[PDB]
């Protein structure tokens, strides 16, 4: 009764974007110059999600072929399921992103106040927001039915056999499917579509500076619109990716924890074999994930209506974080109940972690919760030049453009403290409260309401395109400073939400490395004590030399997108420059860049993806369990890094914008220098970083699936 | 067998011989002199405050290191601490007194031969210091504390006062490696403060009203700079070689005398010991035999090249060096290994899969793993190489495509020499386990005295070239120097790549001697598996690890701070100076700013294990090794490569291969910004993590047996 009650709010939030969706296209249109300048957004945006879509089409359907040959058939169904569910929130969000980048700007001018437009613009994102939230959960309560308790893979929880040999519990395989669809959609999204991204703006300025001799921000400038498109592609479709990715990850990881934790805590007591965590706790605690996220993904929803309802205000920043507040609070109050009302009853749980019995979990996932925020608030304190860090190299641009870039780095490589303290300190008390299966429920609750941050997150752009849009167009002057101020708050959530971004990613690559971990038990474990199974030794030099591996691919990785940029960026201003040759060429531009990041993609989606099974089939399991360690370390730090020092760089060109340092203003030798440094600061951030997010966790999610095979099946 | 033990004092006679012979040199016209004369005063005063430094903080650890512990744990910390101090004090003179008399060969001669020999044999000073101190002090410790007092007899966990438990010999000798650590981390992070101090100052006063040329006797700053290459490349490399040397003897020796209690077995009420003393004594003292060895076909190198023919061909003639070295410790290390190992029982419980001969083929890939590594190096920062090739010519798209250009290029970089580090430790286990993979490290490092006097030959040529146009030679004999300046460019490069591969193969030795030194009296009849085990699953393992990377960025960073604030303070003091020319005032306040600024990096690097280890115990510890070691290792690698290739690609286009731009050029002036940039990155990040990495990993080896049962939570 309440089951299938909790099950309607996917489609509830379904819903709830679409209404959304409706009343902002109701809203007013704007002139004809904005109608002409939203229609080559919308045919650039809409012709690049094409055309990612067509190869995103043809590698799942092979990989959903070999997840079919290999492994079960329900493992490749379920990865189709969840490919299609990803693909579909980022269309619909990017659709409406397009749709409302003028209406933002058309409610600031006809109504010269801010509330109306912040209000449509929130509604703009809530659209990807709860799209992100609603497809993946209704995905995965579909799992949870049609190959869950209805074939009874949540009855058989034994080690399967198939064909092949390759041994797995099946809806462990089966969830691990649904997550990679996820994780091929989000790869694809964030990598080439980040690729193209950074290939547009730089070739922007580019074009500002070439000899076409035609500066950013300016209709003819291809590139400027293409630049418009690319923010909505990343900051709409790509973060909402990686967020999806970070949530189904932390879900499924739970769910695989507990899946394989009925076969390991088995006790062979005689010639038979009892288990000490019974049926019972094993099924309660592989749904509780799910009903836990859809208890935050209803109070999400209810946040999101208070604020699209609540009566307007002046800063746009406490509307949106009244609603993460909202959200985060109802969740926690919730899930309280949830936590103790479903796990009271259970035996074994001491066996398993809980320290604290029933409630253990859920104080592992406020834990999350609190650490989410406090890790965004590090991503807005090394950022934001409201403080220290930020000003300290707007007032040291003074001293050179080499300075900057050198103080730069030191900022960004000394920001990963904090917030990488602050991560420590979670896993540490997540688990003294429930072991790893509560560092996945904290996972999870830091992700609990992934709806609202993925629609703060999605605002930015919108306004973003809403600042553009209005200074090409020359509006009043006034409404261009609404759309200024706007767009600043934007920015700062924008930051933000990379920050939280990355922590969740960090949280769910740990969680799926534990995943990999407990998937390695194999049938003749069955009467080894569980801390011979669940077991990998560092002293192994396999282990070893497979950390090491693991790092330096993650670098290489990173610099490989780097050069990716610039390759892309040049043959976009070669473009541009035939076109001036020969209205320009929107979309052709779009599709020329597009169709060059999804050709270099490869390369990187190559490794990410075939590292685990190239070295597993190599050298084995302990081999890749350390290339997973030293991959989640290095793209943590080097993500952390990447994201911090472009923010910083762009927030100290603002600043200098505003003429604070010593009334220097804009052209000065200084500024000249912050913009060299944030045009090197520009891939880090929106193409490194990002990717790095979801390196750690897919070759992670790929290591879990295949280990399986190569665990046995390794050549040395 | 005592013959062996004599060679370390024979190095050092051969460097005391050799610092005399180039001594006699001539030393040239009087303007050579004076300017010869500020770096000499520089050299000493910097060498003075900072040996003054480190006599305050090695008394304080030795005094601590009593109080807790053993005693002789102490007196080795100190021993070692004043070996390497000794090393490098010599080189250092050495060099500063032979960087004239090499520019006076190249003048007076017109030729390249003499003044190269020179060069090598002021080089070979440092590098046989580093040798023959490093072993001399390694064989008292073997001698006094080890066979005198019955150390390697009793080979048991003694309990000290306090409770302390611990084999005696792994802890003298692991006192001996934190006293090479204690000095490598003074040189390498306020050394190398100091000199990117200098050199970013120098450029500053370039610029400002008082037109203080870069390469102007006025500017005090280019003679600080002049200083600081010695500083930096003969004293910074020249520890950091000597603490991997030792670091991975230490940990040979550290892994055998553990070795002795892990393989006992209850057979009834007995305990039997599977490995008997003697196998175990024996494997104690084979890794000081072949480092012996080394040190031995280092000298027989360094001998051939300097009586051999003169020649035109620099590099040559120093890659001659090198390969004489290492095919004569191969040789002789395989019979020494074969006839040493062959009588002896238990190597099969060792790891050792092919018997007496098994750690020979691990050191010889260690050795090869050198050479391999110190390629990649070059192939990375080279122009004469695709990608600097590359990075130089993209210096025409804008400054903002250098810098991404140099960062891509590096994080690229990181990927060839780890994974040769990869497949050696792979096969440094395959045959001999991780007391094979601490062997491999020590061949790796077999001829650490070639190498550090090749290491050290850069900065004398640099130097020589300096004093040689700064006083206006003869412009072909300016062209000679410079010539010279450019093979030690290359070979400064290749030396820096194989110091941090060193340091990675040593803090991975010290990572697996802290995990053998956790053994406590109570796991005796526990099987081996399950003592010498650090599980990842474990939570604070991983938060370690995160622990430990974040600690190693934040490092990286305030360095880089702190470079910048010195450099500005000499500019401050430089302005100052001429308001009312200052050579030791300003290298005095710049040393001073940066032994100042070295607390904090010392600190953390120092007291992140006791804090960590007294907070949550032994396995945190253990995950912020491995993650320490992980990140430091990329970092290092990735700095060092991007610094070597923006300085690169600048040559490039000086030296016009990039026709259609010279210097002053837009591209010209984007690649002087890319390498004042890097210059920090190379040459303070880079060998500021080598000495992290390895550090970090001694003091834990050091507390772990404090805090494995002394922690708070
Ligand atoms: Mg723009
Ligand atoms: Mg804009
Ligand atoms: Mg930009
Ligand atoms: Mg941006």
């Known amino acids: 009764y309440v089951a299938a009650l909790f099950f309607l709010i996917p489609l509830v939030a379904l819903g709830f974007a679409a209404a959304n969706f409706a009343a902002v296209v109701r809203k007013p249109e704007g002139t004809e110059r904005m109608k002409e300048i939203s229609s080559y957004i919308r045919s650039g945006a809409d012709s690049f999600l094409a055309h990612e879509t067509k190869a995103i089409f043809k590698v799942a359907i092979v990989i959903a072929i070999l997840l079919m040959i290999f492994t079960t058939w329900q493992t490749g169904v379920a990865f189709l399921l969840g490919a299609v569910m990803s693909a579909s929130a ?31 613009a929130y509604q703009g994102g809530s659209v990807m927001g709860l799209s992100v939230g609603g497809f993946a959960l209704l995905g995965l309560v579909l799992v949870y039915l049609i190959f869950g308790k209805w074939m009874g893979q949540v009855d058989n929880l034994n080690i399967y056999t198939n064909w092949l040999g390759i041994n797995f519990v099946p809806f462990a395989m089966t969830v691990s499917g649904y997550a990679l669809g996820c994780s091929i959609i989000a790869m694809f999204d964030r990598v080439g579509g980040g690729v193209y991204t950074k290939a547009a703006d730089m070739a922007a300025d580019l074009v500002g500076k070439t000899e ?13 619109i293409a630049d418009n498109v690319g923010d909505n592609v990343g900051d709409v479709a790509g973060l909402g990716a990686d967020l999806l990715e970070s949530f189904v990850g932390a879900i499924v990881s739970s769910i695989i924890l507990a899946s394989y934790m009925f076969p390991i805590y088995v006790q062979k007591i005689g010639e038979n074999l009892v288990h000490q965590v019974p049926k019972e706790t094993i099924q309660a605690l592989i ?37 993460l507040w909202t959200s985060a609070l109802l969740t926690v109050v919730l899930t309280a109940f949830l936590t103790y009302f479903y796990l009271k009853d259970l035996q074994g749980l001491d066996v398993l972690g809980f320290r604290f019995g029933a409630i253990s979990p859920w104080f592992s996932a406020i834990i999350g919760i609190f650490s989410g925020i406090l890790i965004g608030f590090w991503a807005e304190y090394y950022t934001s030049y409201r403080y220290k860090p930020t000003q300290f190299l707007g007032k040291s641009s003074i001293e050179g453009t080499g ?73 009043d002057p006034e409404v261009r400073k609404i759309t200024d101020h706007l767009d600043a708050v934007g920015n700062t959530t924008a930051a933000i939400g990379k920050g939280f971004a990355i922590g969740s990613a960090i949280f769910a690559a740990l969680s799926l490395f534990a995943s990999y971990m407990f998937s390695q038990i194999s049938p003749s474990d069955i009467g080894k004590p569980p801390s011979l199974v669940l077991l990998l030794n560092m002293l192994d030099a396999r282990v070893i030399a497979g950390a090491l591996l693991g790092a330096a691919i993650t670098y290489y990785f990173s610099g490989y997108l780097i050069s990716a940029v610039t390759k892309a960026a040049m043959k976009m201003v ?70 911090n020092s472009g923010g910083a760089w762009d927030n100290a060109k603002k600043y200098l914008e505003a003429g604070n340092l010593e009334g220097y203003g804009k052209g000065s030798e200084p500024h000249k220098a912050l913009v060299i440094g944030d045009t090197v600061g520009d891939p880090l951030k929106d193409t ?11 070759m992670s999610v ?15």
Do not use: W
Request: net charge neutral; glycine share 10%; charged share 15%.
């Open 90 to 120: 980022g269309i619909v969000g990017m659709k409406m992103a397009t749709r409302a980048n003028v209406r933002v700007a058309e409610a600031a001018r006809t109504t010269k106040k801010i509330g109306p437009a912040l209000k449509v």
């Open 212 to 224: 076409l001799n035609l500066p950013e921000d300016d209709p003819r400038n291809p590139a400027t």
């Open 287 to 323: 749904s509780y994930p799910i009903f836990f996220a859809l208890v935050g993904l209803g109070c999400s929803m209810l946040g999101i209506l208070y604020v699209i309802v609540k009566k307007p205000s002046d800063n746009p920043q406490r509307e949106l974080n009244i609603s």
């Open 403 to 475: 300075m900057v870039i050198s103080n730069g780095l030191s900022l960004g490589m000394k920001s990963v403290f904090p917030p990488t303290l602050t991560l420590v300190l979670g896993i540490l008390f997540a688990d003294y409260f429930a072991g790893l299966y509560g560092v996945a429920i904290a996972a999870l609750g830091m992700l609990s309401f992934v709806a609202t941050s993925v629609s703060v997150d999605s605002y930015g752009p919108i306004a973003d395109n809403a600042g553009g849009i209005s200074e090409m167009c020359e509006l």
């Open 574 to 643: 070669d473009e541009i420059r035939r076109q001036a040759r020969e209205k320009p060429d929107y979309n052709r531009c779009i599709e020329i860049t597009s169709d060059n990041a999804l050709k270099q993609m490869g390369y990187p989606a190559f490794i990410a993806i075939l590292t685990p099974l190239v070295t597993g089939f190599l050298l084995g399991a302990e081999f890749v369990g350390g290339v997973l360690i030293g991959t989640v370390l290095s793209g943590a730090m080097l993500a952390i890094l990447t994201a």
């Open 688 to 698: 490194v970083g990002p990717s790095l997010d979801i390196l750690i966790k897919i």
């Open 702 to 716: 790929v290591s879990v699936i295949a280990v399986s095979i190569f665990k046995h099946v390794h050549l040395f």
